């Protein structure tokens, strides 16, 4: 949330979009 909010995740389910499931954790 906050910084790690809607902007990231490539706006999808926090996995398959933001390259891979590391970036969406940040």
UniProtKB/Swiss-Prot annotation:
Modification comment: Phosphorylated on some or all of the serine and threonine residues present in the C-terminal region. Contains one covalently linked retinal chromophore. Upon light absorption, the covalently bound 11-cis-retinal is converted to all-trans-retinal. After hydrolysis of the Schiff base and release of the covalently bound all-trans-retinal, active rhodopsin is regenerated by binding of a fresh molecule of 11-cis-retinal.
Annotated localization: Membrane; Cell projection, Cilium, Photoreceptor outer segment
Coiled-coil regions listed in the entry: none
Extracellular compartment segments: 8-19
Binding residue positions for Zn(2+): 12
Tissue and organ expression note: Expressed in rod-shaped photoreceptor cells in the retina that mediate vision in dim light (at protein level).
Subunit structure: Homodimer. May form a complex composed of RHO, GRK1 and RCVRN in a Ca(2+)-dependent manner; RCVRN prevents the interaction between GRK1 and RHO. Interacts with GRK1. Interacts (phosphorylated form) with SAG. Interacts with GNAT1. Interacts with GNAT3. SAG and G-proteins compete for a common binding site. Interacts with PRCD; the interaction promotes PRCD stability. Forms a complex with ASAP1 and ARF4. Forms a complex with ASAP1, RAB11A, Rabin8/RAB3IP, ARF4 and RAB11FIP3; the complex regulates Golgi-to-cilia rhodopsin/RHO transport in photoreceptors.
Function: Photoreceptor required for image-forming vision at low light intensity. Required for photoreceptor cell viability after birth. Light-induced isomerization of 11-cis to all-trans retinal triggers a conformational change that activates signaling via G-proteins. Subsequent receptor phosphorylation mediates displacement of the bound G-protein alpha subunit by the arrestin SAG and terminates signaling.
UniProt family annotation: Belongs to the G-protein coupled receptor 1 family. Opsin subfamily.
Name by which UniProt lists this protein: Rhodopsin
Organism of derivation: Bos taurus
Phylogenetic classification of the source organism: Eukaryota, Metazoa, Chordata, Craniata, Vertebrata
The gene coding this protein: RHO
Span within the parent record: 268 to 293 of 348
């Amino acid at each position: 949330y906050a910084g790690v909010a809607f902007y990231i995740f490539t706006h999808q389910g926090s996995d398959f979009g933001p390259i891979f499931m590391t970036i969406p954790a940040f």
